[PDB]
Amino acid sequence: SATANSMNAVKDSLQRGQSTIDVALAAGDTITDLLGKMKEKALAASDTSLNTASFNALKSDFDSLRDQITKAASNAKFNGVSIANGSTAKLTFLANSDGSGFTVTAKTLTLTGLGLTASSTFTTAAAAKTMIGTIDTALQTATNKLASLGTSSTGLDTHLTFVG
Amino acid sequence: TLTGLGLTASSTFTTAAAAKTMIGTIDTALQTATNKLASLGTSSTGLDTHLTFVG
């Protein structure tokens, strides 16, 4: 009977993990939209038929979107814990009454976790032509990270049904 | 404001040569004004996206 009663804490832990991943996925929608817009900026800036003022305008938009990524990744927290802001390497949720864990690997969504830096930018059309492929890699790795978090959330839900 | 655009409350031209220079001055003023408004519009879109996330 005591073993059966302690499963309530296991269920509470699994639901907490699902909430943490929900907040990370909400931040990831913002980040993937921002990365698609930045790819459009670098693609437009790589054209050499632009004059200097148009190129500078595209570069300024690119840098502002890059800062919004940092804002979105830093706010992806659920009651002080995060699986996506880079502050920890993994979270471990309860799997059974003995205290065995259900690990979820952290998927960093900050600029450094995406392969970028706080100073990433382009100053010439050739640098923008390179930034196209850089942002392509960043968007690809971000969607792979969010896909792993979604599979982890479905695994937590299936384990919660089994524990009940 | 006029000082934020690179102009002054007394900006004017008194000769054809001064007007020929003022052409480029006003060009710079319009360029910097459109860049400023573009940054404000990007900030407004960022506030809206953050409001959706907060909800």
Binding site: L25, G28, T32, L139, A147, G150, T154, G164 | -
Partner: protein, 54 residues
């Protein structure tokens, strides 16, 4: 037991089956609302990621 007043195992199984039906209903409501069978990374991560990049 067979004629127990403390434990209703049949009610526990009936509750589990009702919860299964409620979860299916929640899934169908999400599909009707978004118009998507794969609306998030939770539905199918690989196809969701492919569709995002495309």
């Amino acid at each position: 037991a067979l004629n127990s007043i403390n434990t209703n195992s049949g009610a526990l199984i009936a509750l589990q089956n009702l919860n299964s039906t409620n979860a299916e209903l929640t899934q169908v409501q999400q599909r009707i609302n978004t118009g998507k069978k794969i609306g998030s990374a939770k539905d199918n991560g690989a196809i969701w990621a492919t569709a995002k990049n495309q």
